[PDB]
Design a protein around this ligand. Structure first.
Ligand SMILES: [Zn+2]
Ligand SMILES: [Zn+2]
Lengths: 107, 309, 64, 126, 46
């Protein structure tokens, strides 16, 4: 029933942890890989699908300057919500500018 | 540099080009490929729709086989709103009011009695000989007649040739529409094709005149490069480089491959979403943006469930 | 045998474009314009209707 | 590599028609050769799976372990049963009842024809 | 009703009980098919 496994590297090392996200593919795994790499506190962030017969991804996040690597991953997700929310708000308010120019043009 | 959220909300803009029914074309300045590809790949496989899953036959006396008819009915778009309905919990053969829809394709072919003199045309000899999808009767169950008016739950295209009959032959089946995402099977996808392309730029590094401009005018697509007269000579200027197919034809001519710099404009994608008709196309792009947020919220809920702290 | 409902490559509904394709071809259109004027733009869809041998009129001759 | 959605929409879908001429004298020979197809009333093995003549229905799907036909020894009354011992799943397309070359043969020859779907799977050579 | 069988040529619904010789009772033809009746078989649309 679970959907996320955190795997520490050497037990004590919480700087490197490979988030194994269940029921995924390169849709969120590549959008997250773009957002976590936009953090200067992240030395390395790469993902891979495990095997295409499976539907889970690996997502390595490893940081510098002593941050636990779930804080660039919470910031990795919320800063994608804030991007899709703004894309949604500039899309639904640009369709309406198109509908209300198709209406009030020669009708 | 890092993700300045106010650099994004200043440079992003969507410019809708064409939107009639069952089509949409819009631009996206300033989004990167790892988000635009996520929108494209959520349109093709994540936005859920309704489609036929079980088929309960009685007397398929037709030529189209019992298996191929069920597969052919699976690929017919149902004009039900997917957001009203739920997923079926596994193992239920008869779903409830909320899970499933029903239909009934009950067609019998017979000869035309009258006006059948010296003719071999099938429309004049036979009645019900081309089983179209306008022969499907929606059979609402529970209280589904009250949620939807007369004429909402319906096949979309009502011209799709399902079978083809001769007299004596009958099709008496019963269907069960379910809900699913477009990657469990391809019959659930809402979109014909959803794609993008970068806006090309074309930069005349040298002013070309005369007949070399007409030779340039035909290397690109019709409408990209325009030839204008300026005092006896015909000089070429680009005009709307969106039209270009990016076919690299100018890099075959020798003297003119070193005057234009055919490249692409970064992060200026031109989408196009063509719906199959189950939902309008600007509602499919909205419920494709809103799926990536749900994929973020589910993992934020899992992080809240792991660490209480 | 019979025209597929969806195009194989990208799933445009092309099953509702067969009788109106024969109707354009009997009205002296060419096949480069009877695939243009039905709204088939990509050559993966124009493949599906141009190259289709409707093999069910020959198959229904063997009727009871 | 074949596209998955294109495979799902109908790309090179097929069928293979395993037909099987069943004769009750060239195969099943014990005594007097009075074997007609039939079900004995009160046999739970043929309930809703085989028809009232001992042959399966047309359109009825068959799987490994289904009753395939049943034949009624006319002299004793003891009907037998033969089971579908193939691995694949198949649908009975039509059943033709063959007589002899005179026209007076008893109801003991039959030729069941079965559709088997056989879509492209992994390992099918193009 | 008894089972119904259709001749190959003249297409007459000739019922055959399992005793008498098998032939069409109009034109004497020797190969006889079988009629398809109502019963429920569930096929999935996948
Ligand atoms: Zn296509
Ligand atoms: Zn006959």
């Amino acid at each position: 029933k679970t959907a996320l496994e955190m795997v520490q590297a050497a037990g004590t090392d919480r700087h490197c942890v490979t988030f194994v996200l269940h029921e995924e593919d390169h849709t969120l795994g590549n959008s997250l890989r773009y957002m976590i790499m936009k953090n200067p506190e992240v030395e390395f962030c790469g993902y891979t699908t495990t095997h295409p017969s499976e539907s889970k991804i690996n997502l390595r996040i490893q940081t510098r300057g002593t941050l636990p690597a779930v804080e660039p991953f919470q910031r990795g997700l919320n800063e994608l919500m804030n991007v899709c929310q703004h894309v949604l708000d500039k899309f639904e308010a640009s369709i309406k500018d198109y509908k209300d120019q198709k209406a009030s043009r020669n009708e | 540099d890092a993700w300045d959220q106010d650099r994004f909300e200043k440079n992003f803009r969507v410019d809708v080009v064409h939107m009639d029914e069952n089509s949409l074309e819009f631009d996206m300045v300033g989004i990167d490929a790892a988000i635009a590809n996520a929108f494209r790949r959520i349109l093709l496989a994540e936005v859920p729709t309704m489609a036929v899953e079980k088929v309960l036959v009685y007397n398929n006396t037709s030529i189209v086989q019992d298996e191929i008819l069920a597969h052919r009915l699976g690929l017919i778009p149902i004009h039900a709103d997917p957001r009203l309905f739920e997923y079926r919990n596994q193992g239920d053969e008869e779903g409830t009011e909320i899970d499933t829809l029903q239909f009934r394709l009950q067609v019998r072919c017979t000869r035309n009695p009258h006006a059948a003199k010296d003719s071999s045309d099938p429309n004049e000899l036979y009645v019900n000989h081309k089983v179209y999808t306008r022969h499907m009767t929606w059979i609402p169950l529970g209280n589904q007649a009250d949620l939807f008016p007369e004429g909402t739950i319906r096949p979309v295209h009502d011209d799709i040739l399902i079978a083809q009959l001769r007299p004596g032959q009958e099709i008496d089946l019963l269907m069960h529409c379910v809900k699913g995402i477009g990657k469990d099977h391809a019959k659930f996808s809402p979109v014909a094709t959803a794609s993008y392309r970068l806006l090309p730029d074309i930069t005349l590094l040298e002013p070309v005149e005369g007949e070399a401009a007409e030779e340039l005018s035909r290397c690109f697509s019709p409408g990209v490069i325009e030839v204008q007269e300026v005092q006896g000579k015909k000089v070429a200027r680009v005009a709307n480089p969106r039209l270009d197919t990016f076919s690299r034809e100018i890099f075959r001519n020798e003297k003119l491959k070193k005057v234009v710099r055919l490249a692409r404009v970064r992060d200026h994608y031109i989408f196009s979403v063509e719906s199959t008709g189950v939902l309008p196309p600007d509602v499919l792009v909205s419920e494709a943006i809103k799926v990536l947020m749900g994929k973020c919220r589910r993992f934020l809920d899992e992080l809240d469930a792991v660490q209480m702290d | 045998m019979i025209i597929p409902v969806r195009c194989f490559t990208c799933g445009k509904i092309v099953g509702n474009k067969w009788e109106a394709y024969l109707g354009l071809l009997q009205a002296e259109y060419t096949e480069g314009d009877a695939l243009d004027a039905l709204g088939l733009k990509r050559y993966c869809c124009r493949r599906m209707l141009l190259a289709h041998v409707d093999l069910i009129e020959k198959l229904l001759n063997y009727a009871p | 590599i074949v596209n998955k959605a294109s495979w799902e929409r109908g790309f090179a879908h097929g069928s293979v028609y395993k037909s099987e001429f069943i004769d009750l004298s060239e195969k099943i020979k014990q005594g007097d050769s009075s074997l007609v197809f039939g079900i004995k009333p009160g046999d739970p093995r043929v309930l809703q799976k085989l028809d009232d003549d001992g042959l399966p229905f047309i359109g009825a799907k068959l799987q490994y372990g289904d009753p395939y036909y049943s034949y009624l020894n006319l002299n004793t009354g003891e009907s037998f049963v033969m089971y579908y011992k193939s691995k694949e799943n198949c649908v009975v397309d039509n059943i033709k009842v063959c007589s002899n070359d005179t026209g007076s043969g008893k109801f003991k020859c039959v030729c069941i024809t079965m559709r088997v779907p056989r879509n492209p799977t992994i390992g099918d050579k193009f | 009703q008894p089972m119904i069988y259709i001749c190959g040529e003249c297409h007459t619904e000739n019922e055959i009980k399992s005793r008498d010789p098998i032939r069409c009772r109009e034109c004497g033809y020797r190969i006889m098919y079988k009629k398809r009746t109502k019963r429920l078989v569930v096929f999935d649309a996948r």
